[PDB]
């Protein structure tokens, strides 16, 4: 279970921040719904022993010295969204699009 953040937080560590992806801002009018959705993103420093994603992370971070670079703040849980859109054959499609929303953030 990671940490959630907003602009009213002072967290320099790996945290989940909110972001709205705007399909219309791309010029994509073939997407009926949603025009925009909350996708979020991961940012922050990955200090030692903080939100380690895998057992591999703990083992190399313990073994590997500081040299040369620490873990990267990365998603640890994703979720899908529904989307109603026209496809390349101009058909109305109701789909379940995976890997679209960041739910949690960790260190890998």
């Amino acid at each position: 279970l990671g940490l959630d953040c907003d602009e009213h937080s002072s967290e320099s560590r790996c945290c989940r921040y909110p972001l709205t992806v705007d399909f219309e801002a791309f010029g994509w009018d073939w997407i009926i719904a949603p025009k925009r959705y909350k996708a979020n993103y991961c940012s922050g420093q990955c200090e030692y022993m903080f939100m380690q994603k895998y057992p591999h992370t703990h083992l190399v971070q313990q073994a590997n010295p500081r040299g040369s670079a620490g873990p990267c703040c990365t998603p640890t849980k994703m979720s899908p969204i529904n989307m109603l859109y026209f496809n390349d054959k101009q058909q109305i499609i109701y789909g379940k699009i995976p890997g679209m929303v960041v739910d949690r953030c960790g260190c890998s």
């Binding site: 801002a25 791309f26 010029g27 994509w28 026209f86 496809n87 390349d88 054959k89 499609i93 699009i97």
Partner: protein, 80 residues
């Protein structure tokens, strides 16, 4: 098994093979024109009936034309 041009595959003769499709794009910046070409695996074409990566996009001061195709060495840039 489908071959495409890969502008950055400097160790495989600038050629990749996938089960997906061939990708190529031209991005026009206010002062720059760049092109990229690669292969996109099948599981990365989301959604398969209209992938995000194959769709042309545009934003403030940037226009990205894209082209996706399934013939061998079809991701070629061209001119008027």
């Amino acid at each position: 098994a489908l071959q495409c041009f890969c502008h950055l595959c400097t160790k495989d003769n600038f050629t990749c093979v996938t089960d997906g499709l061939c990708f190529v794009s031209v991005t026009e910046t206010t002062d720059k024109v760049i092109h990229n070409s690669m292969c996109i695996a099948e599981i990365d074409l989301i959604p398969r009936d209209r992938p995000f990566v194959c769709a042309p996009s545009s934003k403030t001061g940037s226009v990205t034309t894209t082209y996706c195709c399934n013939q061998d060495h079809c991701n070629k840039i061209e001119l008027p």
